[PDB]
Structure 1
Amino acid sequence: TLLINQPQYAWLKELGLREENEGVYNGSWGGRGEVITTYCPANNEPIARVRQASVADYEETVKKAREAWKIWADIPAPKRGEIVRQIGDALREKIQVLGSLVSLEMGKILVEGVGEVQEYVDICDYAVGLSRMIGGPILPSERSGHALIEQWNPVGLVGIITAFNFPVAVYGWNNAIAMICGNVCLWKGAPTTSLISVAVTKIIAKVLEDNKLPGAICSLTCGGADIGTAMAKDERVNLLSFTGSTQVGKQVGLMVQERFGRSLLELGGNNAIIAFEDADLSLVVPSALFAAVGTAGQRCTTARRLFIHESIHDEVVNRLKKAYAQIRVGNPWDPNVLYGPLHTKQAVSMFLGAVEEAKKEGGTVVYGGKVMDRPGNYVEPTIVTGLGHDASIAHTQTFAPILYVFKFKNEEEVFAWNNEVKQGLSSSIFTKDLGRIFRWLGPKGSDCGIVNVNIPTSGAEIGGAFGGEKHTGGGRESGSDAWKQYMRRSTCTINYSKDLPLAQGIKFQ
């Protein structure tokens, strides 16, 4: 009855998964909390069970994590980098079966499941070199006989709360950077990707244990809102990296600020692609299709708003319709499929609610709009035209493959329309105009954290910092100097001279 008990899914055992799995790791495996069963969204069947963290589990894990930090922080950063290099290799060894698990439990297609693991592998190899580079400048003091140095030190315990839609890579970004920076980590993944969290944690735990290091360096406490709220309120959690909905991130941001902790927020996106009249349409059409329907439209960076200049709107919409019709639907592990199921049955219903609401606001469904007549959580990728850019349904993030299409005329208004929504994650223009490109990158251009040209709103690489502005929450992950959010800066002045301050007419001995 459980997928893991059927011979067809015996590969799950290669990740150390059993029918019932421990969802707490702190050097020891356990879990006295509520038992949840996660389901395969492609067939609505249960996969296996995870025993989540009780309050006592969480309490003991923080204490073990903070004790482990005393050991971990004393390990020189390049040697911490060597640990992270071995994690990358351990992910490389399991990339296919781990990616299959992402496809099975979360529901994205196999290439994206493996691709998500590869992103973690890449950030590991990146972090290895970074582990020899993090630090600050030695600066020229204005004072004779004084040295002035900017030091960076770990903040301590980094709590990491992640979402269902990227159940490996977001944690991996946070883990690899926090680790080389000398922090310990506590992970609370999405409950519906609990098997993924356990499996990832098993791979990391082995590297840590094989190197005679305390496992609490990369702790796991599977749970839901209760555990995440505990982390948000916990003074022992020095940095809380949160990836999830804007609604919850706001509450997490407030709870962390209330205690003068640190938060790193990666919240919703409502991402726009803008196509100008001079754009290469043979580039626009595939870029739009893949940015809209990739991962069944459940990416933070999924394209939700497509603005097309009036002169090319009908052509681009028509070319998208003909292209949508060829999107191959099926099981996410079959390599022929580009499009899998939504993550939950609730999401299917929410998809239908949004299509209906779009119709109520005057939009026309020119393609899709319906649930597919097959098992699982499959819906048609959908294109809605005729809404005004200020339509209410278009200002909501719905994790469904619905692309709202708008007309525009001039550059200034459509830049403003890109910027008018509350999120500020990703954005793209398609144009050949040199001045427009640099204006888009400038202070009167895109207000988002990811600002792309002739490439869609999706697919960012690790070399750059990843994150958004406005209600997207402002945190950054992965590249550039994002590592500084995982460390505390100190400005340090060393007086090494024999000089004595001026007496100022006080007679000292």
Structure 2
Amino acid sequence: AGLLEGVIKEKGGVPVYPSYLAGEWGGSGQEIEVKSPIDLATIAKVISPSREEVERTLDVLFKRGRWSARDMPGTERLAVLRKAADIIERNLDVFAEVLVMNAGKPKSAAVGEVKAAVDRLRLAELDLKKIGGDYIPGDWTYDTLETEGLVRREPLGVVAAITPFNYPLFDAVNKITYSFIYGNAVVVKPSISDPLPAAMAVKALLDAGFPPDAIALLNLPGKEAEKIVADDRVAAVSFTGSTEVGERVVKVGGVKQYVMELGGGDPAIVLEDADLDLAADKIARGIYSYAGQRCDAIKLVLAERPVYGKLVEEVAKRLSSLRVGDPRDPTVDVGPLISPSAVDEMMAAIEDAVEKGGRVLAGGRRLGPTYVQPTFVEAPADRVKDMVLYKREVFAPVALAVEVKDLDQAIELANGRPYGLDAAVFGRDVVKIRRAVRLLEVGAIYINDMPRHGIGYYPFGGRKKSGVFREGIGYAVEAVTAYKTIVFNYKGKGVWKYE
């Protein structure tokens, strides 16, 4: 019900969400169950499109969508987005309810995500800061005399937005927003794990006036989405997911523009002059938020000798005093993980750390097929690098703690992981901070705060295995737009008199 009135089919017993085929909601492919991590129960089904429908949708997006999106002036695109924001905002509780149930996200976090989606849509005007073009005069080279250049951006056409499970609502809205604001049509492919919030977002956009043939929502499972990525009518792919799937995406897509936010964890470094209360507080939150299911979840804590004790102590106190349970109790801090499978990996990873000399300082206990206590494992620097928790990203609420002699060792250990998304540094000395900033191989460094992307007010993205390019208000334009250069020739035409 709600804004999905005539869309959802109460076929049989559970609500059946159809795909949006660039013009009409529908689909005639396999139906698929959508379960909740809260009780492993089926809360709905989605109709995936048949091959012919994928083909027809791409064809519409390309032959008509590109033009409907592009030929709608920017001032109107903004109105559409602002209206969509209004719709989502008045249906807030419902968007939040679905996030909590479908994603297992605590209530406060679920409401935060909806408010992020709304703000993002409402602030699309800020993305215009990187809208101008360039005028290049040609008299700075004899070869270009009496010549002139104009460099401006142009939408690419059809952008494929592939979305992960941890921000089913925000990610779809964000990617649709920055792709559409510049004149592109968009194909959204949400995680089949929790595709419902995307369906709600798309409908809200359509109600707001989004060109009906300029957007599609295909509930394709995993490798079925490869048909979209590899298609030549898809000029760009905005992907947020795991390193491994990202690799597969580029290998299937070949030459195209890409933005790959591949996550991995984030290390946090605490210097001897850091505000330890702030640090402990921020680091604990970074470790457990949404049960560590955040691309930028803190996975490693490095603190200099003289504060390692206090710091680790506080973070552990904070972590163990956390109420775990059903996401609905505004009291609960940590809800469930997306699947029993994820919890298995977390547990196997903790034993590994212990087997290699690691000691659990907090948590450690599993609580159910999809429930676990946020864990903090102490580890000696001379053995941490071979531990799974270090070498890999265990998508769960678990982090390593490691005492270090100085900044160089912290930086070294921090750079030792295969990832490079963000890093956090707590301290006050400008020199040490500047050195850390220069040497940490990451897309972003958070000084005296936990890494938090929010609506992308500041650009962020990966280095190393964390991906390529950036998302963010303004910067995202680089991934879904292409330059168009115009060279004017006035050689010998009397505009300039030798200059």
Question: After TM superposition, is the score higher than 0.5?
Answer: yes
Paired with 1:329 and 1:272, the residues of 2 have a C-alpha distance of: 24
Paired with 1:479 and 1:111, the residues of 2 have a C-alpha distance of: 24
Q: Retained in 1: the 8 A contact 2:173–2:201?
A: no
How big is the shift at 1:282?
Answer: 0.5
How big is the shift at 1:386?
Answer: 1.9
TM-score (norm 2): 0.91
Cα distance, 1:358–1:11 mapped onto 2, change above 3 Å: farther
Paired with 1:352 and 1:13, the residues of 2 have a C-alpha distance of: 40
1:272-287 correspondence runs (5 A):
272-287=267-282
1:390-405 correspondence runs (5 A):
390-393=385-388, 394-405=390-401
Instruction: Give the RMSD, CA atoms, in angstroms.
Output: 2.2
1:139 aligned to which of 124, 136, 141: 136
Partner of 2:69: 72
Paired with 1:13 and 1:78, the residues of 2 have a C-alpha distance of: 27
1:378 has 2:389 as partner:
no
Q: Retained in 2: the 8 A contact 1:117–1:169?
A: yes
Partner of 2:25: 29
Mean CA deviation greater in 446-455 or 34-43 = 34-43
Partner of 1:479: 473
1:56-71 correspondence runs (5 A):
56-66=52-62, 67-71=64-68
Mean CA deviation greater in 476-485 or 266-275 = 476-485
Partner of 1:195: 196
Question: CA-to-partner distance for each residue in 1:298-357, whole Å, 9 max, x for gaps?
Answer: 100000011111222222222222222221122212211211111111112122211222
Amino acid corresponding to residue 347 of structure 1 in structure 2: A
- Secondary structure of the residue aligned to 1:159 is strand
1:46-65 correspondence runs (5 A):
46-65=42-61
1:303 has 2:304 as partner:
no
Paired with 1:216 and 1:358, the residues of 2 have a C-alpha distance of: 52
- Secondary structure of the residue aligned to 2:35 is strand
| Structure 1: runs of 5 or more not aligned | 1-9, 501-509
2:323 aligned to which of 328, 337, 357: 328
Question: CA-to-partner distance for each residue in 1:174-195, whole Å, 9 max, x for gaps?
Answer: 1111101100000111001122
1:178-193 correspondence runs (5 A):
178-193=179-194
Cα distance, 1:407–1:329 mapped onto 2, change above 3 Å: same
Q: Retained in 2: the 8 A contact 1:80–1:131?
A: no
Amino acid corresponding to residue 440 of structure 2 in structure 1: S
2:238 aligned to which of 222, 238, 241: 241
Q: Retained in 1: the 8 A contact 2:107–2:328?
A: yes
Amino acid corresponding to residue 471 of structure 1 in structure 2: K
Q: Retained in 2: the 8 A contact 1:24–1:52?
A: no
Cα distance, 1:461–1:455 mapped onto 2, change above 3 Å: farther
Mean CA deviation greater in 412-421 or 79-88 = 79-88
Q: Retained in 1: the 8 A contact 2:80–2:208?
A: yes
1:42 has 2:35 as partner:
no
Q: Retained in 1: the 8 A contact 2:459–2:473?
A: yes
Q: Retained in 1: the 8 A contact 2:364–2:374?
A: yes
Partner of 2:347: 352
Amino acid corresponding to residue 483 of structure 1 in structure 2: V
Partner of 2:415: 419
Q: Retained in 1: the 8 A contact 2:268–2:300?
A: yes
Cα distance, 1:24–1:460 mapped onto 2, change above 3 Å: closer
Question: CA-to-partner distance for each residue in 1:432-476, whole Å, 9 max, x for gaps?
Answer: 11211222222xx22111211110123444222121111111121
Q: Retained in 2: the 8 A contact 1:15–1:199?
A: no
1:97 has 2:94 as partner:
yes
Question: CA-to-partner distance for each residue in 1:53-82, whole Å, 9 max, x for gaps?
Answer: 221221111111112212221222232222
- Secondary structure of the residue aligned to 2:71 is coil
Cα distance, 1:137–1:102 mapped onto 2, change above 3 Å: same
Paired with 1:428 and 1:449, the residues of 2 have a C-alpha distance of: 11
1:289 has 2:290 as partner:
no
Amino acid corresponding to residue 96 of structure 2 in structure 1: G
How big is the shift at 1:479?
Answer: 2.0
Cα distance, 1:15–1:302 mapped onto 2, change above 3 Å: farther
Paired with 1:319 and 1:402, the residues of 2 have a C-alpha distance of: 16
- Secondary structure of the residue aligned to 1:105 is helix
Paired with 2:52 and 2:285, the residues of 1 have a C-alpha distance of: 45
- Secondary structure of the residue aligned to 2:446 is strand
Question: CA-to-partner distance for each residue in 1:399-438, whole Å, 9 max, x for gaps?
Answer: 1111111111111121122112211101001111121122
Partner of 1:149: 150
- Secondary structure of the residue aligned to 1:384 is strand
Paired with 2:311 and 2:492, the residues of 1 have a C-alpha distance of: 75
How big is the shift at 1:265?
Answer: 0.8
Paired with 2:79 and 2:266, the residues of 1 have a C-alpha distance of: 37
How big is the shift at 1:131?
Answer: 4.6
Amino acid corresponding to residue 312 of structure 1 in structure 2: V
Mean CA deviation greater in 482-491 or 126-135 = 126-135
1:488 has 2:482 as partner:
yes
Paired with 1:116 and 1:460, the residues of 2 have a C-alpha distance of: 9
1:221 has 2:221 as partner:
no
Q: Retained in 1: the 8 A contact 2:130–2:474?
A: no
Amino acid corresponding to residue 377 of structure 2 in structure 1: V
- Secondary structure of the residue aligned to 1:334 is coil
Paired with 2:447 and 2:167, the residues of 1 have a C-alpha distance of: 24
Paired with 2:343 and 2:478, the residues of 1 have a C-alpha distance of: 40
Paired with 1:87 and 1:498, the residues of 2 have a C-alpha distance of: 53
Partner of 1:504: none
1:261 aligned to which of 247, 256, 261: 256
Paired with 2:100 and 2:2, the residues of 1 have a C-alpha distance of: 13
Cα distance, 1:79–1:193 mapped onto 2, change above 3 Å: same
Partner of 1:449: 443
Question: CA-to-partner distance for each residue in 1:130-166, whole Å, 9 max, x for gaps?
Answer: 3586131222222565442111110000001110011
Paired with 2:311 and 2:464, the residues of 1 have a C-alpha distance of: 30
Question: CA-to-partner distance for each residue in 1:348-401, whole Å, 9 max, x for gaps?
Answer: 21222112222222211122112115xx62101111112533133111011111
Paired with 2:36 and 2:224, the residues of 1 have a C-alpha distance of: 24
Amino acid corresponding to residue 298 of structure 1 in structure 2: Q
How many equivalent residue pairs? Answer: 482
Mean CA deviation greater in 79-88 or 153-162 = 79-88
Partner of 1:6: none
Mean CA deviation greater in 297-306 or 230-239 = 230-239
1:342 has 2:337 as partner:
yes
Paired with 2:366 and 2:5, the residues of 1 have a C-alpha distance of: 34
Cα distance, 1:22–1:440 mapped onto 2, change above 3 Å: same
